[PDB]
Every structure is written in C-alpha cells, then in structure tokens.
Design a protein around this ligand. Structure first.
Ligand SMILES: CCCCCCCC/C=C\CCCCCCCC(=O)OC[C@H](COP(=O)(O)OCCN)OC(=O)CCCCCCC/C=C\CCCCCCCC
Ligand SMILES: CCCCCCCC/C=C\CCCCCCCC(=O)OC[C@H](COP(=O)(O)OCCN)OC(=O)CCCCCCC/C=C\CCCCCCCC
Ligand code: HEM
Ligand code: HEM
Ligand code: HEM
Lengths: 442, 271, 108, 49, 100, 59, 55
C-alpha cells in the first residue's frame, strides 16, 4: 500500500512565458481527459454582472468564430471525444475526454473556446430563455435551493451570497457585451490551468499548449492575479416555509478555514466520523455514525450529509438533513448533539476508522482520468501545486483523538451557526434554541 | 405563632422582637398579601380586556382562585388578633346574619359559639393554614385548562401563525417582570412597612372598645362599599356577593365579533 | 368527541384512573392496600384538620387543649380516637403494602 | 425561482459596529460573546449574593 | 342627517386594525362559524390572510406599526370571508330548524 | 483584551463559568457589604452606638 | 437548631405542630407522583407474567 502510493508517478507541472500552468499525470490508459480550469466563479460577478459566467457556460460549446456550431459539435462528436464542464462560486472548468491520441487536437479545441466563443447575438437570445427555464427546474430541487439559501444568509451581503446561476432579471437582460466583458476579464492565462492525465506525455502537451495558447502580457496587471474582497460570515437563519411540501430540508453550519489551512484535514476527518445516512443502507448497526444509527432506531430522517465545503479564504463546515414534517426536531437535536460529542469527548477508536474511511475516499477521489485531471486542475488553482496521495496520507494519517477535539471545538463550540430550512418546518425550534445547542452542559 | 386569645397578639410581637429576622419575615408576608392582590387584580383586568375569559373553564377556575385567595386572606388577618382583626371578624362574619332563617345559626356555628372568641381564632388559623395549599392545588387545574388551548394574545387573532418556545424567551421575560415588580414590593416592605396597615391593629383586641371606622383591608373595600350601598341589610349582602360573583357572567355578556378590544375604541373607554 | 367523558381535560383524568383503566384480572387481595393507604390518608387529613381546629400549640395549653377537645368538643372524643388509631391502621397497611411488593417483585 | 431572493440588510440597522463586510466577523466576536456572557456572568453572580 | 357611511368610516379609522395592515375580516373572532367559513376560503386568499395575520402579530410583537402609506384604506378593504361566513350561518340555521 | 481574555478563559467552558460565579460571588459579597455599610454608617455619623460607645466605655 | 434552642421546649412544639400540619399534604402530593409512575406500566400481578393477555 504505502509502496503503491510511493510508486505512484509524479505530476509534472510547468508555467509558460505566458502565465498558464500546464500540469498532468501520465498513466498508460489509451484514453485520457484534458481541460482548463479557471480561477473564476460567480463570486467574481457584480450585482449586475452576476450570471454572466453561467450565461457564458451555456454558449462555450455552441461554436467559435474559427469554427461555428454545426462544425465544433460535428468535429468533437466525430472523434468520439466528450466535452463537458461547470462553474461554481470560485472555480470554473471545461474538459474533454478522448484517446490521448488527440492531446494536440483536444488542446486546440479547448483554447479555441476559452478564447473565441462566437457569442452569436442570435444564439445568446436563445440560451437566455433556455436558462430561465433550466433555472425554474433547478428550483424544485429543494436539495439545492436549501444550500443556496444557506450561502445566501451565511455570507449575506457579500460576493459569496450570490447564487452561481444568478437572478432571472440579470439573465433576462445580460448583453452580448457583458458576456464578452466577463470573458476578456477573467479568462487569463495566469488564472487558468491546462491539466491532463492518461497516456499523454508532458512535453507533447506543453508544446501543444505553448503553441495554441499564444497569449502575450504587456503591463504588470495582466501578469498579476487580483485577490478578492473577504466575505463576512454571519450567524443567522433563513426560513422558507411551506407545509405544501412532502418533507423538510435543514442545513446548519459554521464558518470554514479555507483551502490553504491544514486543519481542513483534521476537520475533514471529523466529518468522516458523523458520516451520512440514506434509507437505502442496511444498518441499524452502522459503525458509529450514531447519527445514522439513531436516525434508524428513532426514524429521524430520510438522509443527511456532513460536508466541509471550502473556498479561497473561507468556507462552510456543517450538515444537512431531509426529514418528515414531524421528526425535524429530534433529528436536529440528536445531530447537533454529535458535533458537541465530536469536539468534547471523541475517542481514538473513532478517529482511527474516521481516517481509514477518508483514505478510502481520498483514493477513490482519483478513480479514472477525468477525476484525476480534476485534482490537478483544482489542487494547483487552490493549493498552489499538487498534493500526492502519498502526502494527503501523512497529513491525515497523523490525526489522533485530541486533535479532532481541539479543532472541531475550535471551529464549532459556542459559535453562532447559520441555518436554512425550506418545506414544512413548523417544528424546527427557534434560533436561540439551535444556538444554545452549540454548547454542551459539560 | 400561638393560636389562643391569650397568646396570639404577643406571639406575633415576640416573633418580631425575638425571632431572628422574624421582623422581615412578618413584613414580607403581610405586604406580600398585597403584592398578591395587586397582581390578581391586574391579572383579572388583562383577561377582561383581551377576552381571555372566552376560555371559559380556565377562566371559571380563576374566579374560584380569587374567591379562595380572598377567604384565605380574610381568615389570616384575624390571627394577629388586634382591634381590627377582632372587630373586622365580628362585623364581617355577622353579616351572614341577614340570610333569613338558617342565618344566625350559621354565624353562630361558623365561629366558636356566641361571638368571635378563642374557638374561632383556632379554626381561622387552621383554615388559613389549609386554604393556600388548596389554592396551589387548583392553580394546577387552572393552567391545565389553559394549556388545553394556546395562550390568548393582544391582537386576539390566531397565534398558530407563529408561536415561540416558552423557555428560551418567556422564562427570561417573566423573571424580568419578577424583579421589576418585586423591587417596589421590597421598597415598600422595607421603607414604609405600615404604609398600608391600620394602626388600630397594634392594640390587643378588646371587646369593650369598638374602634370608629371598622373597615376590612383595602383589597376588600370596593365591595365593602357596594355592600353599604343598599340599605336593606339583606340586599346589601347580595350586592356584595354579586360584586364578585358577577365575574362568572362576563363570558355570557360578550357580543363583539372581535375577542380583545384593541380595535374597539368605544368599549375601550368604557373599560 | 362522543363519550364526553374521555374528551374533557379533567374527567379524562378520572376515566383513565378509576374507570377504563386496564387492570390485570388475577389481581390478588394484597393489591387492596394502595387503595386503603390512600383513603387512609384522606381520613387522617380530615379528622386531623377537624381536630387541629381545637388544638393550641403551646407548652402551657397543649395537653389540656387535647383533653378539652375530648371532654368538651361534641364528638371530639371520637374524632381524636379515629385520628390516633388511624395512625396505626395507616402503618399496618403501609407495611402490608411494602410486603406485597417485596414479594411480587413489584419493586422492579 | 429562489435564485431571485436576497437577505435584507441588518447592516447598521441592527448589527453591532464590529459587523460590516470585508472584515472577518470572527476576529471580533469572541469579544462580542465575551461582553454578553459577562453581563450574564454578573447576574448569576449578583443573584447568588 | 349623519351618514352611517360617514360613521362607519369614522369607526374604521378609529378601530385601527389597519395600521397593522389587516382587513376587517382578518380580525373576526374564530368561533365555530368563522372556522368552517375560513376552511371554505379559496387557497389564494387563505395564504394571503395567513401572511397578513402573521405580519400583524410581528408588528405587535415589536410594538411597532406599519407606515402610513401601507395602511389599508377604508374603501379598499376586501370582505373576503363575509360571503362565505354568511352561507355557513344560514346553512346552519336551516339545520338548527329542521331538527326541531 | 479583558472581554476577549474573559471569554476565552472564563466564559467559554460551562465549567469555568460556574467556577467564577462562585469565586466572583465571594469577592462581590465581601466588597459589596463593606461598601454598603460604609455608605450607610457615614450617612449617619454620631448617631449609631458604634459612635456613641466610648463615652460610656470610658472616654 | 432542629428543635427550639437548648431542649425540647415550646419553640419546638410549635414547629412540630406546623410540620405535622404540612407534611400530610406533601404525602398526598407525592402519592400522585407514585400512581403516575405506576400507571406508566400496567399494575403487576401474582403470577408475575404479562397481564396484557387479558386486562
Ligand atoms: C378591585 C380593586 C381595584 C383597585 C386596584 C388598583 C390598581 C390601579 C390601576 C393602574 C392601571 C395602570 C394602567 C396603565 C395602562 C397603559 C395603557 O393605557 O394602555 C392600555 C393597554 C394597551 O392597549 P392595546 O390596545 O392592547 O395596545 C395595542 C398593542 N400594542 O392595555 C391595558 O389593558 C390592560 C389594562 C389592565 C388594567 C388594570 C386594571 C385592574 C382592575 C380591574 C379588575 C376588574 C374586574 C372586576 C372586579 C375586580 C374583582
Ligand atoms: C456569596 C458567595 C455565595 C456562594 C454560594 C454558592 C452558590 C454558587 C453559584 C452556583 C451557580 C453556577 C451557575 C451555573 C449556571 C450558568 C449557566 O450554565 O447557564 C447560563 C444561563 C444562560 O445564559 P447564557 O449567556 O446563554 O450562558 C451561556 C454560557 N456559556 O441561565 C442563567 O440565567 C440564569 C442566570 C440567573 C440570572 C437570572 C436571575 C434570576 C433571579 C431572580 C431575582 C431574585 C432573587 C431574590 C431571591 C431568590 C430566592
Ligand atoms: C392565584 C391564582 C392565579 C394564578 C397563580 C393564576 C395563574 C395563571 C397563569 C400561570 C397564567 C398564564 C399567564 C397569563 O396568561 O397571564 C394564567 C392565565 C390565566 N388566568 Fe390566571 N391565575 C390566577 C387567577 C386568575 C383569575 C382570578 C382569573 C380569572 C378571573 C384568571 C384568569 C386567567 C386566564 C383567562 C388566563 C389567561 C389567558 C390568556 O389571556 O392568555 N386567573 N393564570
Ligand atoms: C401513603 C403512601 C402510599 C400510598 C397511598 C400508595 C398507594 C399506592 C396505590 C394507589 C397503588 C395501587 C394498588 C396496589 O398495587 O397496591 C400503589 C402501588 C404500589 N405502591 Fe404504593 N403507595 C404508598 C406507599 C408505598 C410504599 C412505601 C411503597 C414502597 C416500598 C409502595 C410501592 C408500591 C408499588 C410497587 C406498587 C404496586 C405495583 C404492583 O405490584 O402492581 N407504595 N401504591
Ligand atoms: C398523615 C396523616 C397523619 C398522621 C400519620 C397523623 C398522626 C398523628 C399522631 C400520631 C397523633 C397523636 C395522637 C395521640 O395523641 O395519641 C396526631 C395528632 C394530631 N394530629 Fe395528626 N396525623 C396526621 C395528619 C394530621 C393533619 C394533617 C392534621 C390537621 C391539619 C393533624 C393534626 C393533628 C393534631 C392537632 C393532633 C393533636 C391532637 C391529638 O393528638 O389528639 N394530624 N396525628
């Protein structure tokens, strides 16, 4: 095992005279996946700019000036390659998966997109109504509105509070211009990363990129990367009620440290302890995760998930459960009790497993090419370089009990949480109560 | 305390001069009686004008609470056996005398034998000791019936729309009230102890000296008034009885299509 | 509701403790003491209260206040007796009540 | 659509002077809880007396 | 000589249940009739009223009313339940009668 | 940073809080009495026996 | 301190009388709690085996 890790090939990295960082992991696999990952999200938008990046995503594929829609689509389909992508609050990306016999072709396709989207005044107007619709579909997914609302209130009044898709007004009116304005402002080499994994050999990649990414920086701005305005967390709640729904959704959380910070490992290990449930499990005997056990014994919920979603300089460490109108309270009671237990009286027997369960994730985090690429893409972009499983190992292979406590309690104990809840939530006690559910009557 | 014509008055006095912190305890108890009525009177009020009384059962028991709290406070003031204690007992008790036929025989049995004397101080003391526990008993029933329905509110319209956990909030809220109202109690209790107490009740009871102006404690006056309003001794008692018992009728005299009288300026001045 | 004996906040308390209350069929006669113990209490409190109404609690009047209660207070003698002897009925019962529980493991 | 919803402004309106964005709420609140609890700590204290 | 219409308007503004933002009908005490009545009320209205009533409890909770602008004007008060409440009452008196 | 120092050291742990409610009380008592008595007595110079004492105990 | 001051004398007859008058009501109070807890479970029975079979 340790050897298996030790024998895992290093991930080549190198920046251009441009600013783009080109990294990759050579394997053998006849297939592979390459793509660019941008240092851009909704976080970077304005009150009037917000949604661009997304409006933009829906056009990124519909063709370039160098080769219109009918073609781009035809050329990719024709080579059996897959082009897909996404955009969060601080992180966007476009990736392709082909037979590593096409690094050069893929690489070119990529560039041609992150640099020359047609932005056909005629296509735009179409996607405009496609989103407004797609948006009204994202809506009934109470599992997502809830998180949005969480962020909303959690980081109320700041860039983070804005949802990645954006208001209908913005989408109804963004101009062919604004989109261009968003592209030419954030899609710059210094903030972008060209990553890959497969049978591809670094050099052929570099050159190929160094060839199609012919960007040139004049001034110093171009060459530099602007740091964002800090986001203020706020212990608060938001309740979107409607007994009209089948069941309720709840999400509570404290502020997170941020990528850079190490503790995100100990903290990542703690969540592995409370883990997650889901009525399709087979386990009233689930190892620890009493929250799950209890959830089963007393029928506390349909499911729940522990999460340490983080950003550049902040984040959200919390949990979210889906439950029936009548078991909302106990569930919250029992869970919120686990955080305390977590940081007030944890045990080695627990952390031991915690670790293992993580390591197994940590590894399956890299199952395939597309996913690996995702790490290189991210890692660089958010951490600075790449963290080898061999490393993550140690980092989280030396977390003892006392370590979990010290930290969890450092981030959870007597902190003013941020809760959000849509659906039939009459039974969810007031803030004050969930608040004083943040300190154990030790 | 000793409940006997010959030791009562001094047992109390002794309690004040000899029993450590005895003086304070007596004061608190005496003055407390008033804090008690002032509150019970503001409690009635609030209900009378938020139509809280529409919760009949919880309200009817409340009337029983008032009657009980009274009795216990009438028979409790005799104990110190001072001029007013005695004379008050003799005049107010003798009232039943008006009740035709089975009248005299009641009073004449109520207290000792022929007049407020030892055999009644005892039964009064006993009664005084017992009733308060009955108050507490009933007070439980009161809150039970209450809890059946929610608690009423100022705007008199369904609160279900948004309730709040008592403790986190109201516990604090009430404890605040407790101090805000308990401070004057003590200021009064500690600075003007006798502010509300008849001096004539510092003279050991003496059946050969009827004081001029025999009147029950303030919290009874309003009725003492309505009592001597109608001349015919009989009717007088009835007026008295009705002055309080009318509370049982309030719920049947509600006509407004609205519960409270927040949005009822007319009746508001009437109130 | 129909019954109007199972809906009322207070009757419902009674109809659930002295009626409609599920009791085993084979209950022994030893179970008759809880009952007795309770009525034993009602009795004491009564006779006592009624007896306290003639007592004086003072070194110089106690003994005779009781004596007087017996020689002067109508049916006073009976009331004192019942109260005194009642104290015993009370313990005899409470002792048989313990017993029954000790050997039916009621204490579990 | 929920995306169309913002949280009103408590800024100034209610927030204590150590709370206005672009500044970590956390550096300033162990101080904010310190006060409150102090007030409560004092009451329990005065009350015991 | 003096319009009940002049009066009614006097009382309306006198009562003041509008400074809280709620219709007349938002205040009728919920006895048996009003209960049936509200249950027949269309969902549009039910939720409308529900919010109003809660927005009023909250003002009242804060000891603060609604700005003059938002005060419902006499002539715009919508008797949303009276029609219903009416049938309920005559439906009942019909039965209170037959059973005799 | 008292307040902050306070929280960290005294008000964070349910344990610590109670413990300073006591030590805090002992100190409050001793200090609050003296002070009150003082204020009291001073507003009454030469009236209290504590003041008239010496005349008869010699002086 | 229990009794008066230095020996069973007047100051204790009083507090005893008082105590005597008070406690019985506390008995009744608690007696309610007793039956409450009882009622939680059924009533036990001589053969000590589940009575549910027929109450
Ligand atoms: C009998 C013994 C009587 C004598 C006892 C003496 C006590 C003296 C009375 C002091 C009264 C203080 C009143 C301060 C009032 C402040 C105020 O004017 O405004 C009134 C006010 C606010 O109006 P809203 O419409 O709800 O506001 C909208 C919500 N934000 O609320 C006040 O009701 C509740 C007032 C209770 C009145 C206290 C009266 C107590 C006596 C009456 C008991 C009568 C019942 C019959 C017989 C008694 C046996
Ligand atoms: C003189 C020396 C005396 C020493 C004698 C010994 C007694 C020692 C004191 C023991 C008490 C330790 C206190 C433990 C309680 C603290 C607590 O756990 O919960 C606090 C708690 C919640 O506040 P938070 O800010 O949320 O606390 C969060 C803490 N991180 O609840 C506390 O209210 C209630 C505190 C009392 C304040 C309210 C006052 C009530 C008193 C009424 C006035 C009447 C007094 C007059 C007579 C009384 C008879
Ligand atoms: C010593 C006896 C009494 C005590 C301790 C007592 C106690 C209470 C308590 C604990 C409440 C809850 C809080 C509140 O609404 O104020 C209450 C409610 C109530 N009491 Fe009493 N009460 C007493 C006497 C009375 C009297 C005399 C009346 C009747 C004339 C009365 C009428 C009510 C009603 C109607 C409610 C209030 C419902 C509401 O408006 O929300 N109570 N009482
Ligand atoms: C004056 C106080 C007491 C009264 C009035 C009282 C009353 C009762 C009542 C009403 C019952 C129900 C009938 C029965 O099972 O006998 C009961 C049950 C019980 N009491 Fe008491 N009790 C008293 C004292 C005690 C004592 C001293 C004990 C404990 C040592 C005790 C133990 C029990 C238990 C275990 C049950 C019986 C459960 C069973 O076997 O079915 N009781 N008591
Ligand atoms: C729990 C029920 C009670 C028990 C176990 C009990 C037991 C006794 C006992 C042992 C005596 C002595 C009888 C004698 O002189 O030989 C007594 C006396 C007395 N009890 Fe109780 N008692 C009870 C309740 C009460 C209550 C509640 C009152 C009235 C409020 C009361 C008032 C007195 C009085 C005045 C005496 C003195 C008169 C006398 O002893 O004849 N008793 N009681």
């Amino acid at each position: 095992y340790a050897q298996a890790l030790q024998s895992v090939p290093e991930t080549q990295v190198s920046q251009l005279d441009n600013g783009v960082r080109v990294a990759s992991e050579q394997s053998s696999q006849p297939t592979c996946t390459v793509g660019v990952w941008i240092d851009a999200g909704s976080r970077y938008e304005s009150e009037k700019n917000n949604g661009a990046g997304y409006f933009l995503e829906h056009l990124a594929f519909k063709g370039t000036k160098n080769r219109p829609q009918n073609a781009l689509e035809k050329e990719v389909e024709s080579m059996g390659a897959h082009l897909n992508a996404y955009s969060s609050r601080e992180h966007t990306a476009y990736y392709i998966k082909a037979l590593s016999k096409d690094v050069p072709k893929a690489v070119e396709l990529l560039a041609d997109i992150v640099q020359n989207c047609s932005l056909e005044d005629s296509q735009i107007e179409k996607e405009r109504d496609v989103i407004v619709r797609e948006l009204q579909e994202n809506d009934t997914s109470m599992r997502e509105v809830v998180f949005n609302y969480l962020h909303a209130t959690a980081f109320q009044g700041t860039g983070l509070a804005q949802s990645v898709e954006g208001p209908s007004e913005n989408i109804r009116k963004l101009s062919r211009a604004d989109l261009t304005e968003y592209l030419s402002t954030h899609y710059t080499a210094p903030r972008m990363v060209l990553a890959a994994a497969g049978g591809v050999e670094h050099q052929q990649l570099l050159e190929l990129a160094q060839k199609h990414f012919g960007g040139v920086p004049f001034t110093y701005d171009d060459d530099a990367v602007p740091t964002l305005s800090k986001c203020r967390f706020t212990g608060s709640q938001i309740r979107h009620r409607e007994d009209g729904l089948p069941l309720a959704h709840v999400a509570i959380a404290v502020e997170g440290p941020g990528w850079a910070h190490p503790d995100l490992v100990a903290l990542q290990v703690a969540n592995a302890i409370i883990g997650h449930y889901d009525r399709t499990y087979g386990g009233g005997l689930h190892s620890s995760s009493p929250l799950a056990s209890i959830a089963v014994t007393n029928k506390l919920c349909q499911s729940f998930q522990t999460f340490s979603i983080c950003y550049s300089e902040t984040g959200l460490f919390g949990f979210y459960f889906v439950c029936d109108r009548m078991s909302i309270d106990d569930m919250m009671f029992v869970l919120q009790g686990q955080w305390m237990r977590l940081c007030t009286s944890i045990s080695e027997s627990e952390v031991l497993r915690g670790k293992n369960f993580l390591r197994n994730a940590l590894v399956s985090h890299l199952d395939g090419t597309t996913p690996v690429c995702e790490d290189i893409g991210r890692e660089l972009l958010t951490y600075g370089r790449r963290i080898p499983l061999e490393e993550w190992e140690e980092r989280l292979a030396e977390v003892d009990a006392r370590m979990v406590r010290e930290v969890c309690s450092k981030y959870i104990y007597d902190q003013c949480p941020a809760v959000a809840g849509p659906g039939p939530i009459e039974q969810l006690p007031d803030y004050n109560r969930i608040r004083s559910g943040m300190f154990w009557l030790r | 305390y000793t409940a006997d014509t010959s030791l009562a008055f001094s047992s109390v006095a002794h309690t004040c001069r000899n029993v450590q912190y005895g003086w304070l305890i007596r004061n608190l108890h005496a003055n407390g009686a008033s804090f008690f009525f002032i509150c019970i009177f503001l409690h009635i009020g609030r209900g009378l004008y938020y139509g809280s009384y529409l919760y009949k059962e919880t309200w009817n028991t409340g009337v029983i609470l008032l009657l009980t709290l009274m009795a216990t406070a009438f028979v409790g003031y005799v104990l110190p056996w001072g001029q007013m204690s005695f004379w008050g007992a003799t005049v107010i008790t003798n009232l039943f005398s008006a009740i035709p036929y089975i009248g005299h025989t009641l009073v004449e049995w109520a207290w000792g034998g022929f007049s407020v004397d030892n055999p009644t101080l005892t039964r009064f003391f006993a009664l005084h000791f017992l009733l308060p526990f009955a108050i507490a008993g009933i007070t439980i029933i009161h809150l039970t019936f209450l809890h059946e329905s929610g608690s009423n509110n100022p705007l008199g319209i369904s609160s279900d729309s948004d309730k709040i956990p008592f403790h986190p909030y109201y516990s604090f809220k009430d404890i605040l009230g407790l101090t805000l109202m308990l401070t004057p109690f003590l200021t009064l209790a500690l600075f003007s102890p006798n502010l509300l107490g008849d001096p004539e009740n510092f003279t050991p009871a003496n059946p050969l000296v009827t004081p001029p102006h025999i009147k029950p404690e303030w919290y009874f006056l309003f009725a003492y008034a309505i009592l001597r309003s109608i001349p015919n001794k009989l009717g007088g008692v009835l007026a008295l009885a009705a002055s309080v018992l009318i509370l049982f009728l309030i719920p049947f005299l509600h006509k407004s299509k609205q519960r409270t009288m927040t949005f009822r300026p007319l009746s508001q001045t009437l109130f | 509701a129909p019954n109007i004996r199972k809906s009322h906040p207070l009757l419902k308390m009674i109809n659930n403790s002295l009626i409609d209350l599920p009791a085993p069929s084979n209950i022994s006669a030893w179970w008759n003491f809880g009952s007795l113990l309770a009525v034993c209490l009602m009795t004491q409190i009564l006779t006592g209260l009624l007896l306290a109404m003639h007592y004086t609690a003072d070194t110089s009047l106690a003994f005779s206040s009781v004596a007087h209660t017996c020689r002067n207070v109508q049916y006073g003698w009976l009331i004192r007796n019942l109260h005194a002897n009642g104290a015993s009925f009370f313990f005899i019962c409470i002792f048989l009540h313990i017993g029954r529980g000790l050997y039916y493991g009621s204490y579990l | 659509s929920h995306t169309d919803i913002k949280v009103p402004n408590f800024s100034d309106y209610r927030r204590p002077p150590d709370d206005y964005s672009t500044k970590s709420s956390r550096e300033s609140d162990p101080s904010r809880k310190g006060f409150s609890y102090l007030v409560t700590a004092v009451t329990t204290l005065g009350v015991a007396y | 000589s003096r319009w009940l219409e002049g009066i009614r308007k006097w009382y309306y503004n006198a009562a003041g249940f509008n400074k809280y933002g709620l219709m007349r009908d938002d205040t009728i005490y919920e006895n048996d009739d009003v209960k049936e009545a509200i249950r027949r009320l269309p969902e549009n209205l039910y939720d409308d009223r529900m919010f109003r009533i809660k927005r009023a409890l909250d003002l009242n909770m804060r000891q603060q009313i609604l700005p003059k602008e938002q005060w419902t004007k006499y002539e715009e008060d919508v008797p949303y339940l009276e029609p219903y409440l009416k049938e309920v009452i005559r439906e009942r008196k019909e039965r209170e009668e037959w059973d005799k | 940073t008292l307040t902050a120092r306070l929280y960290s050291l005294l008000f964070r742990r349910t344990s610590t809080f109670a413990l300073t409610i006591v030590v805090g009380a002992l100190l409050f008592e001793r200090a609050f009495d003296q002070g009150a008595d003082a204020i009291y007595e001073h507003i009454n110079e030469g009236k209290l026996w504590k003041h008239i004492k010496h005349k008869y105990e010699n002086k």
